[PDB]
JSON list of C-alpha atoms and ligand atoms in Angstrom, two decimals:
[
{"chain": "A", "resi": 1, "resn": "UNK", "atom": "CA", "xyz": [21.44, 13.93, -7.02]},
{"chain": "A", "resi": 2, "resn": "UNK", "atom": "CA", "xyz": [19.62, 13.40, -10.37]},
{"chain": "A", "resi": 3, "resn": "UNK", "atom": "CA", "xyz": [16.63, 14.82, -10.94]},
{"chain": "A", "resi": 4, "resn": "UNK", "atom": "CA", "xyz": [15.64, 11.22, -12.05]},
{"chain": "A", "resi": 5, "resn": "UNK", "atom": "CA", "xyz": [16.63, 10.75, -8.41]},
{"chain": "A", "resi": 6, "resn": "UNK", "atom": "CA", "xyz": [14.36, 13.43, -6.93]},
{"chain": "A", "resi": 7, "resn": "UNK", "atom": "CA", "xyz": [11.53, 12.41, -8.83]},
{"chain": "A", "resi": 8, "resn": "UNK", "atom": "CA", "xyz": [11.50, 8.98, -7.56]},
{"chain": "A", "resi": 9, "resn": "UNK", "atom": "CA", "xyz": [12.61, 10.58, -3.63]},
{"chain": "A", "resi": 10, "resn": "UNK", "atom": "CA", "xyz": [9.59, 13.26, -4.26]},
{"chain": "A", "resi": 11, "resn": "UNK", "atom": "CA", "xyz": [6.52, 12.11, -5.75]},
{"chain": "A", "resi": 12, "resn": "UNK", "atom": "CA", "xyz": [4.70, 8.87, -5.71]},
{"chain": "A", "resi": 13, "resn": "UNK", "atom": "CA", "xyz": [5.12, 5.35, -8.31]},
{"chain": "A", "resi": 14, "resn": "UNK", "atom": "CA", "xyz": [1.88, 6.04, -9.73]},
{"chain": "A", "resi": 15, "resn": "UNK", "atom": "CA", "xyz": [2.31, 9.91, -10.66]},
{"chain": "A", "resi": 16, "resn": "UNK", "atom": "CA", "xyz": [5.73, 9.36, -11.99]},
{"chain": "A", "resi": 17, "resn": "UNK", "atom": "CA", "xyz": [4.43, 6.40, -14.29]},
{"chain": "A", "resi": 18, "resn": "UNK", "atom": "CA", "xyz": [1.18, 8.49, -15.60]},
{"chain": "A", "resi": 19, "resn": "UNK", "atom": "CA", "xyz": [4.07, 10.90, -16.55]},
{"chain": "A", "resi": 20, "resn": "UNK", "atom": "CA", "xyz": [5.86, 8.83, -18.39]},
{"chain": "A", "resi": 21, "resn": "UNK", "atom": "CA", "xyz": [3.04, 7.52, -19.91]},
{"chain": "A", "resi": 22, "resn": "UNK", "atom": "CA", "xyz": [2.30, 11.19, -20.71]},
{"chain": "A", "resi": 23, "resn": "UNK", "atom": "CA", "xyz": [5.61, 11.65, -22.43]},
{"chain": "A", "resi": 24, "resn": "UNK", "atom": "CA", "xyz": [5.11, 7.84, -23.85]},
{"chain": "A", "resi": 25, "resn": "UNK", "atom": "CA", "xyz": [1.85, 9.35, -25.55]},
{"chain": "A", "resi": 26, "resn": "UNK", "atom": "CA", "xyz": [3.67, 13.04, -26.70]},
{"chain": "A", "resi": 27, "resn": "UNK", "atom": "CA", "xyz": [6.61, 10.88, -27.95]},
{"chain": "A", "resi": 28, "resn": "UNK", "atom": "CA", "xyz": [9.31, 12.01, -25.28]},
{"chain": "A", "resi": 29, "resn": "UNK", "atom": "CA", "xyz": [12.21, 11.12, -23.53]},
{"chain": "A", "resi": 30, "resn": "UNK", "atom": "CA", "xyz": [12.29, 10.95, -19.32]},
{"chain": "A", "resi": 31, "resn": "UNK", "atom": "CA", "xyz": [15.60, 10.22, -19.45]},
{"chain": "A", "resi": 32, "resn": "UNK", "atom": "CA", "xyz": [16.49, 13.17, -21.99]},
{"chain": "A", "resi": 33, "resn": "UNK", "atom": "CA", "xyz": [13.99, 15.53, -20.74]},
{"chain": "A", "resi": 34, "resn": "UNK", "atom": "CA", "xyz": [13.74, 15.06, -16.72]},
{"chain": "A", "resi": 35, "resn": "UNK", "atom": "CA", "xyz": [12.47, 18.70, -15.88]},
{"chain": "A", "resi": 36, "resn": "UNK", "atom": "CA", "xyz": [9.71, 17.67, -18.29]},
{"chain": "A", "resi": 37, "resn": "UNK", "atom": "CA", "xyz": [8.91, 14.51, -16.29]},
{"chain": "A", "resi": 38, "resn": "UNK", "atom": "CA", "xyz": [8.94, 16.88, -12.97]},
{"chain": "A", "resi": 39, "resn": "UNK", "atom": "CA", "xyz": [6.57, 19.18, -14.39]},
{"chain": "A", "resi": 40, "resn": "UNK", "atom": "CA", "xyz": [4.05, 16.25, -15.66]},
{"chain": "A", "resi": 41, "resn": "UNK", "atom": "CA", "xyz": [4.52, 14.71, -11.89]},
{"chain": "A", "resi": 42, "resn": "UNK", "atom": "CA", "xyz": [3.60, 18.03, -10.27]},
{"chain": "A", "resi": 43, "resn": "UNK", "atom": "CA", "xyz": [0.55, 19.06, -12.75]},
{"chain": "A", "resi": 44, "resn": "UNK", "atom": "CA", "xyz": [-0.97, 15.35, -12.34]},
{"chain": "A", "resi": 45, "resn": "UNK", "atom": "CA", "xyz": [-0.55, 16.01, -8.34]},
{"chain": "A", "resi": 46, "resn": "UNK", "atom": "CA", "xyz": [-1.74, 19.52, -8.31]},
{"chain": "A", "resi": 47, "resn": "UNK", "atom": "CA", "xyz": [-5.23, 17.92, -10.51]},
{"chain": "A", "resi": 48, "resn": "UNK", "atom": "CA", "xyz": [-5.73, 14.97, -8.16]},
{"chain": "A", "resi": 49, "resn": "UNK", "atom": "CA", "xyz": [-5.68, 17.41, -4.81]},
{"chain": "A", "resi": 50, "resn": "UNK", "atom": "CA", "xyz": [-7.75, 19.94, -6.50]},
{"chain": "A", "resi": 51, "resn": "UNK", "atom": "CA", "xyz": [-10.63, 16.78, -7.04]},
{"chain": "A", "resi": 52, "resn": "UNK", "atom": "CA", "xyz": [-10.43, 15.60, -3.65]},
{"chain": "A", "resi": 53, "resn": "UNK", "atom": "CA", "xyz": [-11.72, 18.29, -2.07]},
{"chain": "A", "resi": 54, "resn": "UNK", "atom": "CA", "xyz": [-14.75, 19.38, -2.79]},
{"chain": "A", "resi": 55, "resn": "UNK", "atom": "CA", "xyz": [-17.93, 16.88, -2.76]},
{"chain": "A", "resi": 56, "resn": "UNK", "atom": "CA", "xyz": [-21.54, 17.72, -3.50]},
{"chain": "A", "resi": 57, "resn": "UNK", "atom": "CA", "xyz": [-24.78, 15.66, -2.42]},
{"chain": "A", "resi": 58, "resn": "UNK", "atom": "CA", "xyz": [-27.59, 15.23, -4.54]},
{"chain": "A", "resi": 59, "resn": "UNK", "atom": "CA", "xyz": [-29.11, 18.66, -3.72]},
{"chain": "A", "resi": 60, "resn": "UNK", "atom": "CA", "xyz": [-25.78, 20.11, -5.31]},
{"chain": "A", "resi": 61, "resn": "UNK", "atom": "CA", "xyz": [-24.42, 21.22, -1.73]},
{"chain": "A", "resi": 62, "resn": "UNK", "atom": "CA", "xyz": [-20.91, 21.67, -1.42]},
{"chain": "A", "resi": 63, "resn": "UNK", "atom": "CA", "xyz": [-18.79, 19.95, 1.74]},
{"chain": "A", "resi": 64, "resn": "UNK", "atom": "CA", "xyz": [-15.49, 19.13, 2.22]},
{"chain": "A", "resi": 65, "resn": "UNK", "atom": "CA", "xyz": [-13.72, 15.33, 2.58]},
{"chain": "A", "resi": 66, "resn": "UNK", "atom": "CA", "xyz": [-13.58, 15.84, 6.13]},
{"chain": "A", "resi": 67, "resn": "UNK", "atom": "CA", "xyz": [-17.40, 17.32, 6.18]},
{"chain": "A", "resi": 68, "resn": "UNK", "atom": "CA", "xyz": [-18.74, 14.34, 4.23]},
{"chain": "A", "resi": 69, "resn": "UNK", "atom": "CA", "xyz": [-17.30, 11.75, 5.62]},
{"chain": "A", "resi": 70, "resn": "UNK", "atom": "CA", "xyz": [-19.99, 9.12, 6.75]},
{"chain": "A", "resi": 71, "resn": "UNK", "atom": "CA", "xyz": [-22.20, 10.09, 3.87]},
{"chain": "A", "resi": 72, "resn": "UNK", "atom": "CA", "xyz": [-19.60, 9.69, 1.10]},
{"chain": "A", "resi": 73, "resn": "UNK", "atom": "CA", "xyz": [-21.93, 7.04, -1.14]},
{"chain": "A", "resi": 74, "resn": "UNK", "atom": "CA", "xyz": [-24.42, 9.47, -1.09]},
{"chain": "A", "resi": 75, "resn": "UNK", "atom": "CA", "xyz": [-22.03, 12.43, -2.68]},
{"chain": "A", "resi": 76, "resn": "UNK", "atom": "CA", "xyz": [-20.47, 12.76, -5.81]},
{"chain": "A", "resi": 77, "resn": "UNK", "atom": "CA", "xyz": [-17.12, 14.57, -6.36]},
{"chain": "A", "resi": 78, "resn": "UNK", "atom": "CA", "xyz": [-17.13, 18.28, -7.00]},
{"chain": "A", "resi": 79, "resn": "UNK", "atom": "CA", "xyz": [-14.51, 17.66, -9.72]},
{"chain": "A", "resi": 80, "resn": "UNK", "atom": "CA", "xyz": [-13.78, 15.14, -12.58]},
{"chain": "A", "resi": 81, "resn": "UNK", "atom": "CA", "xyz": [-10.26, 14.82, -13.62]},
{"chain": "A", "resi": 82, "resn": "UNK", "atom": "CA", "xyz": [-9.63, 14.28, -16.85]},
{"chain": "A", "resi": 83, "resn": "UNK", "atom": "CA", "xyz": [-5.73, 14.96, -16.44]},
{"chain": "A", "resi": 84, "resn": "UNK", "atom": "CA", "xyz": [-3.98, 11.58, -15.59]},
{"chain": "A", "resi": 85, "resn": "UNK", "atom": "CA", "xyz": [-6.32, 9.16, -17.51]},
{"chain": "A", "resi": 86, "resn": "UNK", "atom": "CA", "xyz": [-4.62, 7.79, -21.49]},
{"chain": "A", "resi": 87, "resn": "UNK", "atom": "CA", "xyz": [-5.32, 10.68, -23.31]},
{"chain": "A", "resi": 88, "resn": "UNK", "atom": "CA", "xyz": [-7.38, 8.92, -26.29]},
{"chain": "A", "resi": 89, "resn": "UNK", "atom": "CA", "xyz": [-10.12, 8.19, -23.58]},
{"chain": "A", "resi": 90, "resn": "UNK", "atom": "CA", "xyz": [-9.68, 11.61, -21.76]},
{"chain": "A", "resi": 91, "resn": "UNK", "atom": "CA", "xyz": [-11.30, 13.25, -25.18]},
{"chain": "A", "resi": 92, "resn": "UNK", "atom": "CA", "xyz": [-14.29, 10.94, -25.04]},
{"chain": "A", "resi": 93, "resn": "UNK", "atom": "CA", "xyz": [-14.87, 11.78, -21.48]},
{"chain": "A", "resi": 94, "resn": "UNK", "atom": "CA", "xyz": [-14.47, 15.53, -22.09]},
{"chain": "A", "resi": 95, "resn": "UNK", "atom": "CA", "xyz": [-16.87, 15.04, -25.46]},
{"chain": "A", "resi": 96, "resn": "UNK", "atom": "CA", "xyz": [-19.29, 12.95, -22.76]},
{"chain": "A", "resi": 97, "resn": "UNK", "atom": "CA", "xyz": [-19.42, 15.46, -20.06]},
{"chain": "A", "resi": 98, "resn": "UNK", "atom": "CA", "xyz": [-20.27, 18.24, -22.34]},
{"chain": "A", "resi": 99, "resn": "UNK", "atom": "CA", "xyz": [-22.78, 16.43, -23.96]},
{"chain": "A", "resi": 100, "resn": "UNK", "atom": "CA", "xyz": [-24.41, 15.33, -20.75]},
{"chain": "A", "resi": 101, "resn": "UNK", "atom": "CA", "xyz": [-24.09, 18.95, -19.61]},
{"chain": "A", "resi": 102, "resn": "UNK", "atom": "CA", "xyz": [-25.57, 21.14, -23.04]},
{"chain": "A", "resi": 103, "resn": "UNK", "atom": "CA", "xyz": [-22.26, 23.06, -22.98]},
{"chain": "A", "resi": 104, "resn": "UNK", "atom": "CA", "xyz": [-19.45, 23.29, -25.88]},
{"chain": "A", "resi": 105, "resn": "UNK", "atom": "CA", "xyz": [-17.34, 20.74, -26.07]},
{"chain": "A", "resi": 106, "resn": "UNK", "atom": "CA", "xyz": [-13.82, 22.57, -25.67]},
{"chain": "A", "resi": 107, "resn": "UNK", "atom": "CA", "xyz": [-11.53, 22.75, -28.63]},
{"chain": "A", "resi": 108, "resn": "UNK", "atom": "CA", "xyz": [-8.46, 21.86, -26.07]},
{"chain": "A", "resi": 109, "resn": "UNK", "atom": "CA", "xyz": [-8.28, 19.23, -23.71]},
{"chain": "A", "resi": 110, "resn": "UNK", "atom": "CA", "xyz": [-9.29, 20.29, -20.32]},
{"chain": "A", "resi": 111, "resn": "UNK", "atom": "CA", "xyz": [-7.58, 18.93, -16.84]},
{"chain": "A", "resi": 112, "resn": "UNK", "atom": "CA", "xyz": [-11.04, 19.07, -14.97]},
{"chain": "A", "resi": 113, "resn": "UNK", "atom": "CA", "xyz": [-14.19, 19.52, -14.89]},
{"chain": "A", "resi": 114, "resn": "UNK", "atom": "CA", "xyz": [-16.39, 21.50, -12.21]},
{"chain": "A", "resi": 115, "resn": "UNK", "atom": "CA", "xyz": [-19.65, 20.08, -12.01]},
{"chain": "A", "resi": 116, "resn": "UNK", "atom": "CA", "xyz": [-21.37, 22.46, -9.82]},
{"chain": "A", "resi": 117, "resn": "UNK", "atom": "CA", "xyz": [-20.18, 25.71, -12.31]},
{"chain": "A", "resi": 118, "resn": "UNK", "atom": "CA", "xyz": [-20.76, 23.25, -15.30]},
{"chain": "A", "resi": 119, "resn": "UNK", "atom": "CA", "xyz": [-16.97, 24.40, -16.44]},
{"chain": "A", "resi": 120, "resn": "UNK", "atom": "CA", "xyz": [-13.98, 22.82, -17.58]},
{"chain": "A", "resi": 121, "resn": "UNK", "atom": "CA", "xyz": [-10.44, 23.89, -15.92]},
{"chain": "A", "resi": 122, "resn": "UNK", "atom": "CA", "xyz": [-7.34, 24.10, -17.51]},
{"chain": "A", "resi": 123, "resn": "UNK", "atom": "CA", "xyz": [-4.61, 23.89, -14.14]},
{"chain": "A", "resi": 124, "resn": "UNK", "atom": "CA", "xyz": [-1.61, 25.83, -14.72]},
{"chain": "A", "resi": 125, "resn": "UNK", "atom": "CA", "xyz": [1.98, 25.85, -12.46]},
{"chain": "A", "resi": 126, "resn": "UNK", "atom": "CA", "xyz": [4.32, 28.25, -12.93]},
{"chain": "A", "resi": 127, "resn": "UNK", "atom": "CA", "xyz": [7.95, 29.42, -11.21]},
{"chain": "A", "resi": 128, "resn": "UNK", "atom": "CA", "xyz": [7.08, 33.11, -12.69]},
{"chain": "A", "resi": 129, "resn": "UNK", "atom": "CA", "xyz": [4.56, 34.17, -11.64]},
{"chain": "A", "resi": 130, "resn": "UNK", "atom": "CA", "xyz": [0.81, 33.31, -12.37]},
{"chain": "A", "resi": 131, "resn": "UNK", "atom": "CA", "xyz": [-0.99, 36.40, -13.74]},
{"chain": "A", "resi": 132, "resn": "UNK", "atom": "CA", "xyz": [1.31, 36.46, -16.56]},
{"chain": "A", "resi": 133, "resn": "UNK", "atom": "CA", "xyz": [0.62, 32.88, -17.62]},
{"chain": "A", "resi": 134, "resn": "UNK", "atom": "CA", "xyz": [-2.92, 33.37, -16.96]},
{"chain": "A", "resi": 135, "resn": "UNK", "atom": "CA", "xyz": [-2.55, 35.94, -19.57]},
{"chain": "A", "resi": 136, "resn": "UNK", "atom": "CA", "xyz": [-0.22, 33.81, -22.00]},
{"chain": "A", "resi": 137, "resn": "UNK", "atom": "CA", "xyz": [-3.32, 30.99, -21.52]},
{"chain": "A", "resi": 138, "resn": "UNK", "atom": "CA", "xyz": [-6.08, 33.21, -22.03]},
{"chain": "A", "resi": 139, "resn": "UNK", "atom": "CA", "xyz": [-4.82, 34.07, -25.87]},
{"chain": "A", "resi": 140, "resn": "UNK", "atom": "CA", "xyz": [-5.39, 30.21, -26.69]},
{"chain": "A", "resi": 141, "resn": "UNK", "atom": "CA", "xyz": [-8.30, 29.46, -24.39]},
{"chain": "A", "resi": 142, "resn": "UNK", "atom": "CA", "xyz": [-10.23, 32.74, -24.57]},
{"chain": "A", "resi": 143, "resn": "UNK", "atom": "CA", "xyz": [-13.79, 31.87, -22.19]},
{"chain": "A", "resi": 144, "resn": "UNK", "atom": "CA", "xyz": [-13.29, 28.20, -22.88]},
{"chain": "A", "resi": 145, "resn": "UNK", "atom": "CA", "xyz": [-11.68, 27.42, -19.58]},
{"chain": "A", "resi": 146, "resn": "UNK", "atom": "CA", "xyz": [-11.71, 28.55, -16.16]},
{"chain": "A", "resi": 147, "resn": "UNK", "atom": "CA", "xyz": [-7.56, 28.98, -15.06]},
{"chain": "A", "resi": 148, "resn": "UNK", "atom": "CA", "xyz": [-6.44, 27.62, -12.10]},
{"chain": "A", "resi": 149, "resn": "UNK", "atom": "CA", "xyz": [-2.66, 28.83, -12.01]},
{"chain": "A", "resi": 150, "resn": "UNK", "atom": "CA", "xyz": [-0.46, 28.49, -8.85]},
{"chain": "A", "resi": 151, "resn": "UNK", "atom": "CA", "xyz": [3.05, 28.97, -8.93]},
{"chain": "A", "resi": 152, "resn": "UNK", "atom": "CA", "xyz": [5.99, 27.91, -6.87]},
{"chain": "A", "resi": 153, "resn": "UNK", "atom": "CA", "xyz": [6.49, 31.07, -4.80]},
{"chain": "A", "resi": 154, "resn": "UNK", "atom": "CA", "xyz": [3.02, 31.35, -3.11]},
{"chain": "A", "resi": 155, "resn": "UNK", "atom": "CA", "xyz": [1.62, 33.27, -6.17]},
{"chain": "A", "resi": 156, "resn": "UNK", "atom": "CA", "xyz": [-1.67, 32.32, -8.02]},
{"chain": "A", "resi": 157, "resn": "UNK", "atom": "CA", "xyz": [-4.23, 33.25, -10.16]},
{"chain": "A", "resi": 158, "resn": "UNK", "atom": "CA", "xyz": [-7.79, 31.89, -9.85]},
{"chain": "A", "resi": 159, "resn": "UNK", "atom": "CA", "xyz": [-11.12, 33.17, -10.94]},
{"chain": "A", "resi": 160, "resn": "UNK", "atom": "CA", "xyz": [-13.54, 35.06, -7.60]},
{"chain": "A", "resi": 161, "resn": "UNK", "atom": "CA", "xyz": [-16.05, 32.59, -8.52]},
{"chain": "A", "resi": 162, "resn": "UNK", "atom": "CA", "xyz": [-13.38, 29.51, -8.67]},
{"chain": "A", "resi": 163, "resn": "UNK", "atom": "CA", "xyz": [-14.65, 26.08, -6.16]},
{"chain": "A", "resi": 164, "resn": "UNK", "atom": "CA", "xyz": [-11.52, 25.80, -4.92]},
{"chain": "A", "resi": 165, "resn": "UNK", "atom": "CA", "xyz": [-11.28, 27.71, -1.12]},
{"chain": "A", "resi": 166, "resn": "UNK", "atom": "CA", "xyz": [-8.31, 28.93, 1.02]},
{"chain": "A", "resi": 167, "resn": "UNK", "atom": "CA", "xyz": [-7.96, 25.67, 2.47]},
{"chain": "A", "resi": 168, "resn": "UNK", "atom": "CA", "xyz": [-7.64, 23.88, -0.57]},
{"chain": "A", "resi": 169, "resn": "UNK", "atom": "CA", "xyz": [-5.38, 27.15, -2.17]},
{"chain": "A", "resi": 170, "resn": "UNK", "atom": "CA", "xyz": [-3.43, 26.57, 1.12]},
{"chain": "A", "resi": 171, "resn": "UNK", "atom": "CA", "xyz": [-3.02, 23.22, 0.61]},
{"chain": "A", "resi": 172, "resn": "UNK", "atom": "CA", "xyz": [-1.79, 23.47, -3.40]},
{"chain": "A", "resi": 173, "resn": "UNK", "atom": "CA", "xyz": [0.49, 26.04, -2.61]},
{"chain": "A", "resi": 174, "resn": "UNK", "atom": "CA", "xyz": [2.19, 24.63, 0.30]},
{"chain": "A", "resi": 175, "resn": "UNK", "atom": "CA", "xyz": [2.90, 21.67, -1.47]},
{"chain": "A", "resi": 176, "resn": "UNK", "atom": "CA", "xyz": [4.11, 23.34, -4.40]},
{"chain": "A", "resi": 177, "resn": "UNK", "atom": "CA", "xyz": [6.60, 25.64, -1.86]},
{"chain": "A", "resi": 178, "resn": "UNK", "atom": "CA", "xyz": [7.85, 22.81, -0.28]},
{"chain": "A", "resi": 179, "resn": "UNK", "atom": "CA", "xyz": [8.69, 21.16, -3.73]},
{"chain": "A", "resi": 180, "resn": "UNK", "atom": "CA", "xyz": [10.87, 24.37, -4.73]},
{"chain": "A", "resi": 181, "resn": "UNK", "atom": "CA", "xyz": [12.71, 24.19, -1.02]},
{"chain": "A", "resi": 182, "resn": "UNK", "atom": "CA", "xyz": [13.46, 20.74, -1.72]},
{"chain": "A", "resi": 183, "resn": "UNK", "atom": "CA", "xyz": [14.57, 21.23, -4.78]},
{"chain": "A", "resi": 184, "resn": "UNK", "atom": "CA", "xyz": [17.06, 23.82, -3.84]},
{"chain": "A", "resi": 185, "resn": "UNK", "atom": "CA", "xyz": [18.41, 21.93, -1.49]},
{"chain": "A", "resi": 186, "resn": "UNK", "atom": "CA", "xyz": [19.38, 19.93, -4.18]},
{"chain": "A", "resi": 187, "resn": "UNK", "atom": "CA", "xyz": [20.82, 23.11, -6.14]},
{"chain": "A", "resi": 188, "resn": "UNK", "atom": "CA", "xyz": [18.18, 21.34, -9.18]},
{"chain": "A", "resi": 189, "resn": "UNK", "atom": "CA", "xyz": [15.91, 24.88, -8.50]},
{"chain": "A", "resi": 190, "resn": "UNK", "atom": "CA", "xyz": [17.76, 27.18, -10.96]},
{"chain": "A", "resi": 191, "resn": "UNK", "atom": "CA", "xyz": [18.35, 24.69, -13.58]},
{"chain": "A", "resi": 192, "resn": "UNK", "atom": "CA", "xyz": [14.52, 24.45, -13.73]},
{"chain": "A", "resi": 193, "resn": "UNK", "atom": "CA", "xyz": [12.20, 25.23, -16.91]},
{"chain": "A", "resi": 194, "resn": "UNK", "atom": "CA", "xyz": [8.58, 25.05, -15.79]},
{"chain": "A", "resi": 195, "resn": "UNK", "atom": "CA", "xyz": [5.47, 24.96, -17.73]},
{"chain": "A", "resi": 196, "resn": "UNK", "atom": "CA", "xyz": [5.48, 29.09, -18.91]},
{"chain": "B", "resi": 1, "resn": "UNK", "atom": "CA", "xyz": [-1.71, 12.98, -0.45]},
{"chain": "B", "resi": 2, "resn": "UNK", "atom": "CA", "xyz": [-1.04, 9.68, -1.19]},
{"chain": "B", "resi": 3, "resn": "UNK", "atom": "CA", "xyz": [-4.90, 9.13, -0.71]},
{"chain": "B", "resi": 4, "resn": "UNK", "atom": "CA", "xyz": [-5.96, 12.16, -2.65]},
{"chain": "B", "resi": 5, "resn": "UNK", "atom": "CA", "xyz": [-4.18, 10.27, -5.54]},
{"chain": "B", "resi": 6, "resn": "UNK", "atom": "CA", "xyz": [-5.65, 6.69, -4.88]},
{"chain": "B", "resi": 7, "resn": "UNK", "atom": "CA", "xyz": [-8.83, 8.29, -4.41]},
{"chain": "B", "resi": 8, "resn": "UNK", "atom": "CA", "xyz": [-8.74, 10.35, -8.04]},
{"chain": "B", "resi": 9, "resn": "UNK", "atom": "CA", "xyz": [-7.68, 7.32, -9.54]},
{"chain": "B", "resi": 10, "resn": "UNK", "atom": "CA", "xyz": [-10.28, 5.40, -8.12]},
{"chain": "B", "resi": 11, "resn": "UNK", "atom": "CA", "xyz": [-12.58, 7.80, -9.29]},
{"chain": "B", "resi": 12, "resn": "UNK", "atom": "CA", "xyz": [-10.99, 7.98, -13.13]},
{"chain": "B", "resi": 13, "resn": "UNK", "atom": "CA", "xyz": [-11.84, 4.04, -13.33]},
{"chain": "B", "resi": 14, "resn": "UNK", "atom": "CA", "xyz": [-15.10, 4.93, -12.20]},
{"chain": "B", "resi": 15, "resn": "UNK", "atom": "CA", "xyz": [-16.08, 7.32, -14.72]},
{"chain": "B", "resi": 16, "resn": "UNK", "atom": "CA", "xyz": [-15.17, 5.43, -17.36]},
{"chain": "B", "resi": 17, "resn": "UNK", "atom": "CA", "xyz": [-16.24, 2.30, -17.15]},
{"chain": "B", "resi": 18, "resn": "UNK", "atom": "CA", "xyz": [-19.86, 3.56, -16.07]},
{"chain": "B", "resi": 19, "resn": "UNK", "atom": "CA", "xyz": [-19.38, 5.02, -20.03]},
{"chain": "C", "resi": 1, "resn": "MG", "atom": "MG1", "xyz": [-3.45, 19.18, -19.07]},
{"chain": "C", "resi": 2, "resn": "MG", "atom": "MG1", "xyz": [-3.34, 22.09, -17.11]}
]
């Protein structure tokens, strides 16, 4: 099987087409590079279930999908994702949100942004394993960023004050573990580079 | 999963048209 072919077998139409469109915008190849277009698809993912977790009301409490359902007009998500819209308009929102929030504007284009911390999140997945790129990260971001980093062998490395709970974790990592089983299956695990 | 992904998208329209 190609990994073109996995991609399309694996991951929704509109994930693999915002990576493309990723690779469109940093002047790459799908066809040339598909273990790039993999990686996009699962970072996009990983954002998108992240964000649809966490709501908060008005009073900035926190609840779950499940927990607000009923009341959703009234809540707000816990997250913006900036990862996944054109890049040219992701800056302006990032520039926005800052602004609207009195907080730096980060030199590097966030993934999301946690509006009950008031902190943008850089997400991070690895097949090593996640402390080390946490560390690799940290030397460009420094305190810009929180780091969200999961990797494909139930490792991760998230801040004690991170949003995201074990449910959510749970939810990331089985995903993420069920990607690399599939994968092997398909003998396209060890060929893989990954983000780090 | 699917609607996790409708949902952010949703959301990403959102956002930027109320800028
Ligand atoms: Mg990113
Ligand atoms: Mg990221």
């Amino acid at each position: 099987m190609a990994m073109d072919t996995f991609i399309t077998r694996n991951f929704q139409t509109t994930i693999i087409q915002k990576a493309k469109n990723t690779m469109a915008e940093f002047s790459e190849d799908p066809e040339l590079q598909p273990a790039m277009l993999f990686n996009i698809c699962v970072h996009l993912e990983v954002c998108y279930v992240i964000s649809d977790m966490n709501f908060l009301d008005e009073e900035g409490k926190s609840y779950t999908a499940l927990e607000g359902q009923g009341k959703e007009q009234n809540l707000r998500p816990q997250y913006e994702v900036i990862e996944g819209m054109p890049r040219t308009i992701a800056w302006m929102v990032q520039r926005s949100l800052a602004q609207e929030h009195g907080i730096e504007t980060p030199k590097y284009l966030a993934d999301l942004f946690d509006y009950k911390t008031k902190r943008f999140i850089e997400v991070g997945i690895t097949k090593g394993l996640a402390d080390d790129y946490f560390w690799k990260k940290k030397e460009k971001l420094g305190n810009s960023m929180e780091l969200m980093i999961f990797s494909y062998n139930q490792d991760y490395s998230l801040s004690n004050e991170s949003s995201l709970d074990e449910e959510g974790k749970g939810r990331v990592l089985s995903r993420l573990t069920e990607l690399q089983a599939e994968l092997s299956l398909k003998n396209l695990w060890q060929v893989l580079i990954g983000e780090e | 999963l699917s609607n996790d992904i409708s949902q952010g998208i949703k959301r990403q329209r959102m956002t930027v048209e109320s800028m």
